[PDB]
Amino acid sequence: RREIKIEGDLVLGGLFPINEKGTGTEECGRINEDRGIQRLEAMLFAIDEINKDNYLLPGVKLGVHILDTCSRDTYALEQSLEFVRASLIPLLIAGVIGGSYSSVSIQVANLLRLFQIPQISYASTSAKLSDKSRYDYFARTVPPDFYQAKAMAEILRFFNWTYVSTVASEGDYGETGIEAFEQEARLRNICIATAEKVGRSNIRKSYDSVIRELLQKPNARVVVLFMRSDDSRELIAAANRVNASFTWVASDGWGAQESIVKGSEHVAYGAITLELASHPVRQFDRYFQSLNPYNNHRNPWFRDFWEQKFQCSLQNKRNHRQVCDKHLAIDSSNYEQESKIMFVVNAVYAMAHALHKMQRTLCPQTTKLCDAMKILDGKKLYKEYLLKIQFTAPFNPNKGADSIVKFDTFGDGMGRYNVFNLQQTGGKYSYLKVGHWAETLSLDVDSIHWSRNSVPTSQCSDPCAPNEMKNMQPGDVCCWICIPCEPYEYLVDEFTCMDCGPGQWPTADLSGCYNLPE
Amino acid sequence: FMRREIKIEGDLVLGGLFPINEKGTGTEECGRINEDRGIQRLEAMLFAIDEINKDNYLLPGVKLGVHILDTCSRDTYALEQSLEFVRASLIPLLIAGVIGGSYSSVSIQVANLLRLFQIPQISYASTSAKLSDKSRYDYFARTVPPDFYQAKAMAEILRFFNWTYVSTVASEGDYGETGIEAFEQEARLRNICIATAEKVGRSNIRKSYDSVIRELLQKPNARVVVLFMRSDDSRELIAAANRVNASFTWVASDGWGAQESIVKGSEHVAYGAITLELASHPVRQFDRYFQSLNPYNNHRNPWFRDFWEQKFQCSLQNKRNHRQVCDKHLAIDSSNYEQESKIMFVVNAVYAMAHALHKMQRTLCPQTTKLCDAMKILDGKKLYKEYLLKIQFTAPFNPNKGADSIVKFDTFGDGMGRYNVFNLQQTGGKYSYLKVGHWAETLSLDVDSIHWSRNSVPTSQCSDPCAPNEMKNMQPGDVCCWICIPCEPYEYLVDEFTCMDCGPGQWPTADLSGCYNLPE
Ligand SMILES: *[C@@H]1O[C@H](CO)[C@@H](O)[C@H](O)[C@H]1NC(C)=O
Ligand SMILES: *[C@@H]1O[C@H](CO)[C@@H](O)[C@H](O)[C@H]1NC(C)=O
Ligand SMILES: N[C@@]1(C(=O)O)CC[C@@H](C(=O)O)C1
Ligand SMILES: N[C@@]1(C(=O)O)CC[C@@H](C(=O)O)C1
């Protein structure tokens, strides 16, 4: 029953998957170090900054009510009830920053709209959230997967991978994510060997069952993944067991997380993953590294985070061993800023800027929460916020690389992705940016380290022998058979054989015919 | 300080929502007691639970409890209350399902909240067609029909008396706005034009209605005004009409229904109005129960006193600093109480839930009649689809079984569409509503018993009638308006729309129906 409650003139609720999904009967599991703790700290950071900022909400201190979602929508929903009971000890909520997993953002949105409470997700990408008739109070600083799906399809179409398999996560993130991909797939002439899908609470066996079915399509050596972070971890693990190997092409669900591949590094080597395009918030690196169990008491999950990151123990852990070195610290050698921090910070500032514009508008005489703002009009706020356009929280250099935060009519953000390749070059395994997708694909093929040192081949049927075989398309448009030709025929084209005619015989290379002597 | 509610423990508990109180004005949330659609409907539920808890063939071995809350006729308030039902599934009583939502707005909002936790809900009065959408309201069902039909009934009454130029005024929201839209679509099909489409909204004050009465008056030919408004809104509109003593022939939906309270203090302005209401047959046993209630025996209903003191203009020692203590011999009876039109639906609703829980308990608990472990934590989704497939004969309180007195649900979870038409009369000095027809699948009403306003069957058409002597009827672009073209002194009317030359030798009759020969 942990939570962060900091009082303020106005309070923002937050939701982060601080903990991984609990297995079996338990609701919460291990600490989600990067996407959980880091993202949570980034919001605390943003709030701190805004509270030192004399040009943004001066005179109005922002407070927070942050809750753990334990990576489960139902859990996130019961937690959220805490935000609405408020509008009746309980803190009034101006708006809610949060929802990492699309499934929780969606469910929380269904609840928050009933009380007209604006919500901004810093990571949920499901296309469903764009539906403003169902999620009329939801915005996000990231784009919908309508685009990430295109980026993936075009990557495949580029390297001519026409026969690929797909495994997706049950839910609003994976299923709609994959569906979008499959549609983009047909359009680019790409067939799906097998469409696998893992679901809720699935145990090892469900995944082992998928690795097999994937292996039952040997020609399909490229497997497209649209799965939850946790699910992706399980699939790569199930592939390690039976030492199965494919070329993975996964969505941001997997992203650039090194934790997903830990303990199976060789099985995911040479994988291509996508992640939202962003640039680290330097000032945040300073803030985070300065954090330790001695100075960070406002984060009730920090000690568990600490003990797990360093394999610690103090006097606040389970009945184990190995006390912890008091000189331990989060620094440049054991920490790398999470890919979406920028979006978390921008989401909090978006809400901040929105409240500020509203405060200047309804409270023209002071910098304080006058009476007209005593009870916020959530509906209005959402459309004083949708029209928001501002330069990325100071923490972003320049202003030319369109570092402006604003929203669609749907409330979404700009669709920019970076393509990564899992490498290991220097003994260690890391993610290298090998391209990106702005509106069209773009990647320097040379820097990509493929699995088995060779640019993968993923086609339904084998290439034809030159010397004679012709390409023959059966009923579909991805599979074909190779029919050798009569020694007197030549290949008028890849698909057709033709008699060279009397007096003539085909050329050694079969491209044409030549006269016969005697 | 004191937010009232009814909490009776049981093996299984049903939540309930009723507009016990009227919408509070201005800053206050709850206002006056809604005697009929409030207290009566509340007591009808307690009545139903009581019967069910004495019934050894229904839920024997399982005692139903209740958690009833006031909606104060406001969706937002209802919503805050409903939170009580879900916090439970985490002092707090576990909710098996919720009986409730009078106003379509509260049902819709509550339905939005309740599906998040798979809690089945049955409304005994909300008629908004939106509720039929099982993709937004997948845990909502209702023992009444969708207004898709009530609108047709209304259009067909107009098309019957040939009222082609009518004005409409709807209440903002999912009840009034979708209701009228439906009507206007049924209007076009039956060639009926709409003079002016007015619409009152949330928190509107006197001036918003007066502004409407005026705009209605600026369409004098349109003497028939179609209403699709909230009960309270209807009260305001008729009050705004009484002020400027304006008078129209009102055709209102069940929002107005057959409530006498809506017309009180303006009886003459609404005389001869036609209103619809869901077709029902009083529940006799309920009459007995309700009349037997008094401030001495009925302590479980925390709103009863206020009800009492207001129905009788009372006082005891539990009222405001007023006067006139009350006669301890007062009592609800045949002379001061009439069963609210929809009570039968409240009872059928509470029973539909019971029957559902009952069939489920027999299925998952094959050994006893008690809530076995399998039902310790109800699967709401399953309940909703053990419930949709429910078909039973109206709680004993309904005679026969031939007039299809079976309660069941559409694939959408709606009930059957049957309405009764009412005429506001006063014949015996007193103003009351008289059933002057009904709509099953086709209209049907004995026009003879209808007491119109200004003793003449209203006329509601776009243009003024033509002068006999010469004018011919001429239809421009539409089929509602027309111009009157007088005819040449040598032409007669071969018919209401055509003028013709009498031809040489002949001349039109004074009458203009024929031609006569010319002398000289
Ligand atoms: C197939 O893909 C290769 C690798 O990029 C490319 O060079 C070639 O032009 C492609 N051919 C087709 C089928 O368009
Ligand atoms: C409606 O108009 C038709 C056509 O003029 C007429 O025959 C019918 O009697 C009218 N109905 C009534 C009762 O007004
Ligand atoms: N885009 C994510 C989602 O919508 O669920 C997939 C990974 C999530 C994350 O960044 O943690 C966000
Ligand atoms: N059918 C109603 C509605 O949907 O609002 C109109 C009148 C209401 C009532 O009877 O209380 C119910």
Q: Which long-range contacts (CB under 8 A, 24 or more apart) does A355-359 make?
A: A355/A10, A355/A57, A355/A60, A355/A62, A355/A94, A355/A95, A355/A381, A356/A56, A356/A57, A356/A60, A357/A384, A357/A388, A358/A384, A359/A57, A359/A60
Burial of A244 (0-12, 13-18, 19+ CB in 10 A): middle
Report CA-CA distances (Å) from B334 to A396, A473, B24, B190, B290: 78, 87, 30, 43, 11
Residue type, B438: H
Could you give the CA distance from residue A131 to residue A135 in angstroms, rounded to a whole number?
A: 6
Residue pair A144/A412 in contact by the 8 Å Cβ criterion: yes
A270: left (phi over 0), alpha (psi -120 to 50) or beta: left
Could you give the CA distance from residue B240 to residue B166 in angstroms, rounded to a whole number?
A: 19
Domain shared by A350 and A294, yes or no: yes
Q: Whose CA is nearest to atom 13 of ligand 2?
A: B161
For residue A465, give the DSSP letter.
P
Domain that holds residue A259: 144-277+415-453
| Domain end position, chosen among A414, A442, A470 | A414
- Give phi and psi for A381, each to the nearest 5: -45, -45
Domain shared by B47 and B107, yes or no: yes
Which residue of chain B has the CA closest to A134?
A: B136
Report CA-CA distances (Å) from B149 to B198, B275, B288, B446: 22, 15, 33, 21
The ligand with the least distance to the CA atom of A38 is 3
Annotated binding site of B: 41, 104, 125-127, 175, 254, 342
- Chain B residues inside the 8 Å CB shell of A81: 83, 86-87, 90
Residue pair B468/B451 in contact by the 8 Å Cβ criterion: no
The ligand with the least distance to the CA atom of B228 is 4
Could you give the CA distance from residue A142 to residue A414 in angstroms, rounded to a whole number?
A: 6
Could you give the CA distance from residue A118 to residue B155 in angstroms, rounded to a whole number?
A: 41
Could you give the CA distance from residue B427 to residue B500 in angstroms, rounded to a whole number?
A: 49
Could you give the CA distance from residue B466 to residue B484 in angstroms, rounded to a whole number?
A: 5
Residue type, B236: E
CA–chain centroid gap for B514, Å, is 53
Residue pair A480/A461 in contact by the 8 Å Cβ criterion: yes
Residue pair A193/A223 in contact by the 8 Å Cβ criterion: no
DSSP line for A35-49: IIIIHHHHHHHHHHH
* Method for this entry: X-ray
- Chain B residues inside the 8 Å CB shell of A77: 116
Residue pair A253/A231 in contact by the 8 Å Cβ criterion: yes
Report the SS3 class of residue A247: strand
Domain shared by B131 and B46, yes or no: yes
| Domain end position, chosen among B368, B389, B416 | B416
| Domain end position, chosen among B455, B477, B505 | B455
Could you give the CA distance from residue A388 to residue A391 in angstroms, rounded to a whole number?
A: 10
Task: Mention every residue, 6+ apart, whose C-beta is less than 8 A from residue B199.
Answer: B169, B170, B171, B172, B176, B177, B180
CA of A125 to the centre of ligand 3 (A): 6
- How many other C-beta atoms can be found within 10 angstroms of the C-beta atom of residue B325? 11
Q: Inspect the interface and report whether the beta carbons of A85 and B83 lie closer than 8 Å.
A: yes
Task: Mention every residue, 6+ apart, whose C-beta is less than 8 A from residue A286.
Answer: none
Q: CA dihedral in degrees (B484, B485, B486, B490; nearest 10)?
A: -140
| A125 Cβ inside 6 Å of ligand 3 | yes
Could you give the CA distance from residue B224 to residue B163 in angstroms, rounded to a whole number?
A: 7
Strand order in the sheet with B432-439: B193-200, B165-171, B224-228, B249-252, B274-278, B419-425, B432-439, B443-444
Mutate to test the pocket of ligand 4, among B132, B142, B227, B254 (most ligand atoms within 8 A of CB): B254
Which residue of chain A has the CA closest to B111?
A: A114
Sign of the C-alpha dihedral computed for residues A308, A314, A315 and A320 taken in this order: positive
Residues lining ligand 2, Cβ inside 6 A: B 161-162
What is the 3 state secondary structure string of B24-58?
CCCCCCEEEECHHHHHHHHHHHHHHHHHHCCCCCC
Could you give the CA distance from residue A361 to residue A129 in angstroms, rounded to a whole number?
A: 29
**Both tokens assigned to A456:** 């993968």
Could you give the CA distance from residue A80 to residue B90 in angstroms, rounded to a whole number?
A: 13
Domain shared by A408 and A429, yes or no: no
CB proximity B86 to A under 8 Å: yes
Domain shared by B151 and B39, yes or no: no
Task: Mention every residue, 6+ apart, whose C-beta is less than 8 A from residue B327.
Answer: none
Residue pair A55/A3 in contact by the 8 Å Cβ criterion: no
Reported as type and span, the H/E element at residue B494 is strand B491-495
Could you give the CA distance from residue B290 to residue B297 in angstroms, rounded to a whole number?
A: 12
Residue pair B244/B216 in contact by the 8 Å Cβ criterion: no
- How many other C-beta atoms can be found within 10 angstroms of the C-beta atom of residue B297? 9
Residue type, A330: I
Report the SS3 class of residue B514: coil
Could you give the CA distance from residue B71 to residue B30 in angstroms, rounded to a whole number?
A: 9
Domain shared by B285 and B140, yes or no: yes
| B113 CA: distance to closest CA in chain A (Å) | 7
- Chain B residues inside the 8 Å CB shell of A84: 83
Could you give the CA distance from residue B133 to residue B30 in angstroms, rounded to a whole number?
A: 30
Which residue of chain A has the CA closest to B118?
A: A74
DSSP line for B266-291: -TTTSTT-EEEEE-----HHHHHHHH
Could you give the CA distance from residue A285 to residue A288 in angstroms, rounded to a whole number?
A: 5
For residue A210, the number of C-alpha atoms closer than 13 Å in the C-beta half-sphere is 27
Q: Which of B422, B39, B20, B450 is nearest to B254 (CA)?
A: B422
Q: Which of B41, B1, B26, B9 is nearest to B347 (CA)?
A: B41
Helix, strand, coil abundance in chain A, percent, nearest 5: 30, 20, 50
Of A77, A88, A115, the CB nearest to B116: A77
DSSP line for A404-425: EE---SSS-----EEEEEEE-S
The single residue listed with the structure tokens 């059957």 is B416
Q: Whose CA is nearest to atom 5 of ligand 3?
A: A101
Task: Mention every residue, 6+ apart, whose C-beta is less than 8 A from residue A201.
Answer: none
Q: Inspect the interface and report whether the beta carbons of B116 and A111 lie closer than 8 Å.
A: yes
- Chain A residues inside the 8 Å CB shell of B87: 81, 85
What is the 3 state secondary structure string of A121-140?
ECCCCCHHHHCCCCCCCEEE
Residue pair B463/B450 in contact by the 8 Å Cβ criterion: no
Task: Give the mutation candidate from A81, A88, A128 for the B interface (greatest B CB count, under 10 A).
Answer: A81
Q: Which long-range contacts (CB under 8 A, 24 or more apart) does A512-518 make?
A: none
Q: Whose CA is nearest to atom 11 of ligand 3?
A: A100
Q: Whose CA is nearest to atom 1 of ligand 2?
A: B162
Could you give the CA distance from residue B413 to residue B137 in angstroms, rounded to a whole number?
A: 10
Mutate to test the pocket of ligand 1, among A154, A155, A158, A160 (most ligand atoms within 8 A of CB): A160
Q: How many residues does chain B have?
A: 520
Helix, strand, coil abundance in chain B, percent, nearest 5: 30, 20, 50
**Residue B507 belongs to domain with CATH number:** 2.10.50.30
Q: Which of B252, B248, B71, B73 is nearest to B147 (CA)?
A: B252
Could you give the CA distance from residue A367 to residue A360 in angstroms, rounded to a whole number?
A: 8
**Residue A366 belongs to domain with CATH number:** 3.40.50.2300
Mutate to test the pocket of ligand 4, among B231, B275, B277 (most ligand atoms within 8 A of CB): B231
Which residue of chain B has the CA closest to A111?
A: B113
Q: CA dihedral in degrees (A217, A218, A222, A227; nearest 10)?
A: 50
| Biggest CA pair distance of chain A | 109
Alpha helical stretches, state H, A53-120: 73-86, 102-112
Q: Across the A/B interface, how many CB contacts are shorter than 8 Å?
A: 24
Domain shared by A168 and A103, yes or no: no
Domain shared by A390 and A341, yes or no: yes
Domain shared by A443 and A513, yes or no: no
Could you give the CA distance from residue A369 to residue B145 in angstroms, rounded to a whole number?
A: 48
DSSP line for A265-306: TTTSTT-EEEEE-----HHHHHHHHT--TTT-TT-TTHHHHH
Strand order in the sheet with A62-68: A4-6, A62-68, A10-16, A93-98, A119-121, A138-140
- Chain A residues inside the 8 Å CB shell of B136: 134
Q: How many domains does chain B divide into?
A: 3
Domain shared by A437 and A377, yes or no: no
Could you give the CA distance from residue A485 to residue A498 in angstroms, rounded to a whole number?
A: 8
CB proximity A244 to B under 8 Å: no
Reported as type and span, the H/E element at residue B171 is strand B165-171
Report the SS3 class of residue B503: coil
- Give phi and psi for B273, each to the nearest 5: -85, 150
Domain shared by B469 and B320, yes or no: no
Which residue of chain B has the CA closest to A109?
A: B116
Domain shared by B139 and B8, yes or no: yes
